[PDB]
Amino acid sequence: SGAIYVGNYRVVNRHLATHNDWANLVWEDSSRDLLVSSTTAQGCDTIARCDCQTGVYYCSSRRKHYPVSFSKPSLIFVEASEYYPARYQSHLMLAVGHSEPGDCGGILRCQHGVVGIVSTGGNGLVGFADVRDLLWLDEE
Ligand SMILES: NS(=O)(=O)c1cnc2cccnn12
Ligand SMILES: NS(=O)(=O)c1cnc2cccnn12
Ligand SMILES: [Zn+2]
Secondary structure, three states, X not given: OOOEEEOOEEEEEHHHOOHHHHHOEEEEEHHHOEEEEEOXXXXXXXXXXXXXXXXXXXXXXXXXXXXXXXXXXXXXXXXXXXXXOOEEEEEEEEEEOXXXXXXXXXXXXXXXXXXXXXXXXXXXXXXEEXXXXXXXXXXX
16 A cells, blocks of 8 residues: 655555545556545655656555665566556566565655656566656646
8 A cells, every 4th residue: 555645736656546536536557556635634745757767665565665676667468466456557666575465555755755656566567656746636
């Protein structure tokens, strides 16, 4: 689990979005596993605007933050998970690291702020859904 809280926006994995998230929907993309909903109180997180390929992610299944190198956001084939079938996911970054289904929502962060959230796992890789292209998160 986990979300990004930026302004009056809540960024979550689409597959973990709640009824309240859908009832307060701003934007969702199944191909990216992202959903954004509205908040009443303002959030504590800042979005990275950058092309960093190094950062740190939170892994709930180790209760540890790991420094990782990660690929730039691409269209990647993902094998079947407890929450998705084998399919192609867009705006996905991969790193070598531990990721189980419950680790989805963990933040990846660089020196500029929040890069993305854990979205995929298996075979010793962790995949993160990028949010740095979503400039509209910073306003309105
Ligand atoms: N490496 S860690 O201390 O962050 C850790 C590993 N396993 C647990 C269980 C509870 C709390 N912390 N914890
Ligand atoms: N990725 S994070 O910095 O927001 C984080 C730190 N500790 C937890 C526990 C659950 C979800 N997320 N989380
Ligand atoms: Zn950065």
